[model samples]
Target: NESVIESCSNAVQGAANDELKVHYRANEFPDDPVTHCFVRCIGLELNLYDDKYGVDLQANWENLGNSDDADEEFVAKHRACLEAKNLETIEDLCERAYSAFQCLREDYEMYQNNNELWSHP
Candidate 1:
C-alpha cells in the first residue's frame, strides 16, 4: 500500500524531468537562456536528491531553494523513515514536501507573469 505510493511518487518525479527536457528542447528558441538554465537547475536538483536519498522517493522530493540545502534535510529524514520503515512518517514528509513545492511553483509562476508584464510594457 505505502510502497505503491512511494513507487508512484518516484514515477511522477521522473516524468517531470522528462517533461521539462522536452519543453526545453521543443521551444522555438531552443537556445532560450531561461529555459536552459531552469532545465539545468532541475537536473542538478534531481541528481542531488538521488545521491542523497538513494532514489527511493526521488519523485516526491522537490528543491525548495538550493538542491544541496534541500537534500540535507530530505536525506536525513528520508533515511530515517526508510530505515525504520515508518510509512506514516514517510507519508507525512512527502505531503509536506509536495505542498512546499506547489507553493514554490506558484510563486515562480507569478514572478514570471509579472516579469512578462513589465517586459511588454
Candidate 2:
C-alpha cells in the first residue's frame, strides 16, 4: 500500500509538470485570442483581476475605459477561456504570480492597446 501511494504521488507530480509544458509560451505566444484570453483568465480566476491589482488594466480588461477602448470579443474570450482553464483547478498558466504574463508577446493586437500590460518581454 505504501509503495502504491509513493508511486501515485510521483505520477501526480509528473502530471503537473506535463500540464505546465503547454499552458503558456512565456514571453512568446501565438499572439491570438487564445493567448491574451489565457492571461486574463488567470487573473480573473484568483480574484486578482481587479482594481487592487491594477485598476486601469482591470477596467480595460472589463471593457470600461474610454481611454482603453478594450475589445469586446477579446473580453468575452477572456472570460470563456479562464472558465475552461479554471474548471480543472490547475496551472501553466502556472501558479498565480509565478507565471504571469508569459502568454503574450508584443505582436498581438492588444499589446499596444493594452499599453504593454500583457507584454512579458
Candidate 3:
C-alpha cells in the first residue's frame, strides 16, 4: 500500500510542472483523502484499476473486458481497504454485476463539494 502511494505520488508529481507540483504536493507523500483521491482519479483515468480485473484490487477492471487475470495475492492484500470504505464486497458476483458501466456521467448540480477543479478559474 505504501509503495503504491509512493509510486503514484512520484509519477503524478513528476508529470506536473515543478511550480504547481510543489503546491499540489505532486512531489510529496500522500496522507489525506484529497491527495489519495487525486491519485485515485489519476488511476481511474488511466485504467490501472481495470488491469486488475477485480474490485478488491481497488479497480473497476471486470467492466473493461470481463477478463479475470487479476492476482490473488494482490486482491487479498487490498481487500480490507475496500470493505472498510464501505465499497462492500458482498454478493458482488451476483448483484454487483449491474453497476458496471464504461463511464461516469452526471449533471453540473450533482457534486458533493465546491469542486473548483471542475470549473474555470
Candidate 4:
C-alpha cells in the first residue's frame, strides 16, 4: 500500500512538474491551481476522486479502513465532502478534489498525523 501510494505521488509530481516550485507543509496547502491539481492527479490514481462524478466513497472507505469506530463518521464526512463539489472546469474539479481530500482528513486523528499520506513529495 505504501509503495502504491508512493508510485502515485511520483506520477503526480511528474504530471505537475512545471509548477513544482515549492512544497507545502503537511497541514498547509497553497492557494493555487497547480497545488490543487497536483492533489487531484494523485487522488485520481488512488481512486479516491472522479472528475465527472465526485468522491468515490466506496473506494475511499476501503482505503480509509472500515472500522466499527469510524464507519458512521466516515460516511457522514464523505457526504459533506461530496456535497462541496463545484466541477464546472478543470480548475473547479481540482479544487473540489483537494477540498474533499482535506475534508476526509478532519476527524481521522491517525490520518492527521500521517504526514506521508498528506504531503507532496
Candidate 5:
C-alpha cells in the first residue's frame, strides 16, 4: 500500500513532493494540479478510478474489507461524493477523485487516517 502511493507520488510530484505532503499530512485536499494528478494516479493504479466513469466505490469498499457485498453507508456517501460535482475528462476525474477522497477520509476517519489510506497516518 505504501509502495503504491509512494510510486504514484514520485510519478506526479515532480517538485511538489514536499508541498503535497504538507496538505496530505493535514488530511486536506490538495490545492494544485500536480497534487491532484498524484491522487488520480494512485486511484488509476489501484483500479479504483475510471477515466470515463469515475471512482469505483465497490472496488474501494472491497479493498477495505473482505465482503463481496456492498456496505450501504459507504455506498451512500460515495454516491453523494460522485454526484457532488459534474464534469468530464481526466482532469474532472482528478477533481472528483479528491472530493471523494476527502469525503471518505472524514467518514472513515480511524480506518483511513490510521492506515494513511488517503492521507498521511
Candidate 6:
C-alpha cells in the first residue's frame, strides 16, 4: 500500500497548498499545523505540477510552510481536507490550484475529463 500512501500524501499536499493559496490571497499569514502540512503537501504538488505542466512554480509557494508550533486543529483540518472525496470539495480545490496555474502560466495545462491524466490528476 505504499503507492496508496504516496498518493494520499500527494493528495494531502495538494489540498494543503490549495488552502494556503486561499489564505495568501486573503492577506492572511497561514498559521501552523495548517502551515506545516501545507508546505509538505505543496512540495509534492509542485513536483507533480512540474511534470504535468513542463514548467515549475515551486518557488512561488515554497515560502508558505508552517512554523514548528502549528496547532492540532490545523493538522486535523488538513487530514480532513485530504480525505474528502465529495465532488464539490475536491472539484473546488482542483479548480483553485489547477485553474490558477492555467491563469498565471501559459505553459501550464489542465486535463479535462476526457484526458487519461484526468482520472489521476
Best-performing candidate as measured by lDDT: 5
Mark the 10 consecutive residues where model 1 has the least summed lDDT.
48-57
Residue pairs in candidate 2 whose N, alpha carbon or C atoms collide under 3 angstroms: 23-92
lDDT of 4 by residue, 13-107 (tens): 34334234334323345666666866777667776676666666666666655533435656666675556543434367667777767766654
Best-matching candidate per TM-score? 5
Model 6: lDDT to the true structure: 0.35
User: Candidate 2: where are CA atoms >4 Å away?
Assistant: 1-66, 91-94, 97-121
Q: How well does model 1 score by local distance difference test? A: 0.35
lDDT of 1 at 24: 36
Candidate 3, 1-121: lDDT as tens digits: 3454445555553434454345444334234434544444444454543212423232333423336654554344344333343323434322221121112212111221224011001
In model 1, the Cα lDDT at residue 106 comes to 44
TM-score of 3: 0.31
Cα deviation in Å at residue 68, candidate 6? 1.0
User: In model 4, which residue pairs have backbone atoms overlapping below 3 Å?
Assistant: none
Every candidate's CA RMSD: 15.7, 13.4, 16.1, 6.9, 6.1, 17.2
lDDT of 3 at 15: 32
Ranking by lDDT: 5, 4, 2, 1, 6, 3
| Deviation (Å) of 1 in candidate 1 | 36
Ranking by TM-score: 5, 4, 3, 2, 1, 6
lDDT for 82 (candidate 6)? 29
TM-score winner between candidates 2 and 4:
4
TM-score of each: 0.25, 0.29, 0.31, 0.57, 0.67, 0.23
Evaluate residue 56 in candidate 2 and report its C-alpha lDDT on the 0 to 100 scale: 25
| Model 6 regions lying over 4 Å from their true place | 1-42, 45-65, 86-121
Backbone clash tally for model 3? 1
Model 2 agreement with the true structure over 1-121: per-residue lDDT tens digits: 2333233324433322333324433323334444444444444543434322321234445433245645666545544444443423433333432223332122234554665233111
Worst 10 residues of 5 by lDDT: 112-121
Q: What's the CA error at residue 14 for candidate 1, in Å?
A: 3.7
Please, what is the whole-model Cα lDDT of each candidate in the order they appear? 0.35, 0.37, 0.35, 0.56, 0.61, 0.35
